[model samples]
Target: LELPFSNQSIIPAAHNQKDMEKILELDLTYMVMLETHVAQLKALVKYAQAGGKKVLLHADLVNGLKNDDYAIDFLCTEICPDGIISTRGNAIMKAKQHKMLAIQRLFMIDSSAYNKGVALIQKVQPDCIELLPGIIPEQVQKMTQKLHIPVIAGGLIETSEQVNQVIASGAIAVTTSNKHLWEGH
Candidate 1:
């Protein structure tokens, strides 16, 4: 499965109820939630879908969820997230099996981690890849070319210029916690 349509340059990565409320109040259709409880997720998903937003759940950090394949099964089968993001390859592959837009989160630390992250992507084959420390516009194109999948730039994105830079760097989209970057407030 693929992410829903949205014309905005940035996708909000909400970390709290207040962050989610801000996302809900916006005109954007795509959002990612990094911090949430298992109890509240169904409601949150319903709320976002009700407002015509496609919310991707970050499965690793959710409270009361085991962050395992079974948890992915619940998220895909029961909660029905538009997509699921995880640092774990198994979780991402499970999402793909469920026909959900699976995203594998990778960090750009250094040589060994970079090689491993790239190797992991080749193995898991997520629909998309989210590169942490989204500011490195320079590395975007190189990675996209190597991975052959849409790259989502996220983490520490605080300005519109960074958004443009990431996009120009070949990112299909960006995820940010900075509410100011959300289109039209």
Candidate 2:
């Protein structure tokens, strides 16, 4: 199971334009903009897209907008992002409704959580799923095989071995902020 793309989590609250520029220089296809900085998120997406990079608008901020309507409205009207990264069903469904790619981010790795996550997948049918604790190959393999959906490995992937293992285990790609793992552009 080869990954279809690489997912990069960008904390707009922490990263300014210069930091984002550094990240954009990496060999990543997709970027996840943290929902904390809504204004910065929009700017980063526009900037990244302008640089030929796709963005997955991360809408999981604590006090940020959680409903699909706001997320959808923002993605469709304001930013017009290439896709979305959400933990809510409505967000996923809304992304689909607008013909935008939806990538659900799943937390927890236990059986119950996995089951619930799978159920949501069946219902929303997101374009992709980014499994948390993405360093675990078995988990990646299980979710991808069970759902038959493209899986991206994210969360704490700090080494080349971890990245390669996840990719080998059926993850389309791995996300990380570790500069050591990133080679020259």
Candidate 3:
């Protein structure tokens, strides 16, 4: 399926105002923000959107709201982010229902977690899968091959070499909070 954002290699993370400011100056098309309260979400999305960037907010990480249908509804209708990242199946379903770019964040902690995540994504069928602790290229490749869905490797991706390796492993992109890696991407 065609994803919403551009096909860039590194998705910068905006953890704070400084990061957001830096990201706004970059040429990257996609930006990921982890936690924001309901109060800040709307303004934050607007600010990012004004910078010509597509915002991907993590539904479960929102500070004030619970990760439920009501929260997703408020997000989809009110805040209206360009994309939604979530571990909850219902949240993904809700985002998809609203025609938002739904990304399922999967934590492959173990074999059981991997199996469960795969099954959950298969049921939800999000636009993409974000596999955390994305240092393992082999696992990224495995998930991509098994699901036949575009995979975005995230978390613990520190170096440019690791970023390149992950992309080479068949990940469409890699997410990093590291400013160094974000440069020259």
Candidate 4:
């Protein structure tokens, strides 16, 4: 099977640790530390990797240092996560250079911005493209066709039907913060 879509923003804060534990108990394939404490993020990534779970390092926050080459090198050398998720093209390229699978997560704060992000992904060609507002099937199809790369549908995918719809539309997988990892009909 392909690598699982991770729960973004699950670490770096002490308060979220409880939620992270719950997510782990549900057998999530991957977990991400969304731009927070580097020490804590490294610890959590190691902790998850020890249990055979993949961890994604998110480098999208203004405060997040994972975008730095040093941080990425440290994570790869010491923590050894399954991959890295980044919004910046430079970070994604760096991750690929390090031989880690790079996933580009695009945030479409406004629906109007989706196409531009999709075009950017097509040009950059990372290992995978993660799109927000995972419910838009038509957009997913169009992007998938345009990019021809693996498309992972994420953000606001709360129900099985929505998950199924995105997958049907050409998304390789669906990601969510919700526990159970797609359990229940």
Highest lDDT model number: 3
> In candidate 2, residue 118 scores what lDDT?
86
lDDT of 1: 0.85
Rank the models by lDDT, top first.
Answer: 3, 1, 2, 4
User: How well does candidate 4 score on lDDT at residue 174?
Assistant: 69
**Superposition-based RMSD of candidate 4 using all C-alpha atoms, in angstroms:** 4.2
lDDT of 2 by residue, 67-173 (tens): 55776777667777777778898888887887877788898568899889889989989888878886778888877778688877778877777877888898776
Candidate 1, residues 78-182: lDDT per residue as tens digits? 999788899999998899889989989999888798899999999999898999889999887789888578889898888888889988888888988887778
- lDDT comparison, 3 vs 4, better candidate: 3
Per-model C-alpha RMSD: 1.7, 3.6, 1.1, 4.2
Q: List the residue pairs that clash in candidate 3.
A: none
Lowest summed lDDT over 10 consecutive residues: which window, candidate 1? 1-10
lDDT of each: 0.85, 0.69, 0.87, 0.67
Model 2: lowest-lDDT 10 consecutive positions: 6-15
- Misplaced by over 4 Å in model 3 are none
Q: Could you tell me which residue pairs clash in candidate 4?
A: none
Compared with the true structure, what per-residue lDDT tens digits does model 4 show for residues 30-60? 6655545665766776776776667666666
In terms of TM-score, which candidate is strongest?
A: 3
Residue pairs with colliding backbones in model 1 are none
Q: 28-90 in candidate 3: lDDT tens per residue?
A: 988998878788789999999998998989898888899899999998999987889999999
